[PDB]
């Protein structure tokens, strides 16, 4: 299965030139950029692991491209994403996020159904990779 | 274990001639026919996967037999079922359903018991095939 989190997941994996252009668009707005990693893709897993501090005043995509290159050869198999933050009054939140590295294969998830009162069910979403191996060796 | 969902599961697997006769009975009533597939046989799994659109005005079982033949050679190991729908005022629901293809072997299910207040138990039914492999490779 293909994980569909992010804004461009219905398009093929993007090339390095493609990635650089999107970065160039965020810096022209004055946004701060950062890179994150994880091996637990549950949709309610809000905090991915941080790769260094956010690049606040960098004004050249080459600096962002370099950091991503390092993570790629340094981190274990899993997922990598690039985010952009806007600290303007009225926003003070993230304004863009897309995946930029995936595992060789992802088995996906399945549902568990606990029966409670009347006809009500309490659902739990479960990951095949997580349940099988500890962090660092899931993919 | 043998899954007992459907109207003829206490009888041996039906032959192609047997299946054709039941189809001929539903079309003489004017019902619409469709074919579905799944690899998760939980009794509360209401939505199986659809194989094309329902055949509304087809008036010859040969058309239904052909579609079932295709699914058999196209879909992965699992279960296949044929349903008949009646859109008449007062009904507007399914009026027949039977299994027409099974996996080589089905391990079945087991129960988990969570203890709550007093002597009350919250039960959960679990499938051996589902918990072991992702969709597409369970059988």
């Amino acid at each position: 299965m293909r994980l569909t989190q992010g804004c461009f997941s219905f398009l093929p994996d993007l090339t390095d030139q493609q990635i650089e252009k999107q970065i160039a668009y965020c810096i022209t707005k004055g946004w701060a950029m950062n890179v994150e990693w994880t091996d637990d893709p549950h949709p309610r897993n809000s905090y991915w692991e941080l790769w260094g501090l956010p690049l606040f005043d960098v004004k050249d995509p080459a600096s962002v491209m370099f950091e991503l290159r390092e993570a790629r050869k340094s981190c274990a198999a899993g997922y990598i994403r690039i985010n952009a933050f806007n600290a303007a009054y009225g926003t003070e939140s993230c304004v863009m996020s897309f995946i930029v590295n995936r595992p060789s294969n992802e088995p996906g998830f399945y549902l568990e159904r606990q029966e409670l009162e009347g006809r009500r069910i309490a659902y739990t979403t479960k990951s095949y990779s997580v349940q099988a191996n500890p962090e660092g060796g899931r993919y | 274990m043998r899954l007992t969902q459907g109207c003829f599961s206490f009888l041996p697997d039906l032959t192609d001639q047997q299946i054709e006769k039941q189809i001929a009975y539903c079309i003489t009533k004017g019902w619409a026919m469709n074919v579905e597939w799944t690899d998760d046989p939980h009794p509360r799994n209401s939505y199986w996967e659809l194989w094309g659109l329902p055949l509304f005005d087809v008036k010859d079982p040969a058309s239904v037999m052909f579609e079932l033949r295709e699914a058999r050679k196209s879909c992965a190991a699992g279960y296949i079922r044929i349903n008949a729908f009646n859109a008449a005022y007062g009904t507007e629901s399914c009026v027949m359903s039977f299994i027409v293809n099974r996996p080589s072997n089905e391990p079945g299910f087991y129960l988990e018991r969570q203890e709550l207040e007093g002597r009350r138990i919250a039960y959960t039914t679990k499938s051996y095939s589902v918990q072991a492999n992702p969709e597409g490779g369970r059988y």
């Binding site: 088995p107 095949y128 099988a132 191996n133 899931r138 993919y139 | 992702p134």
Partner: peptide, 8 residues
Amino acid sequence: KWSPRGGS
């Protein structure tokens, strides 16, 4: 060896 054993 303990990573490819499970989670295909």
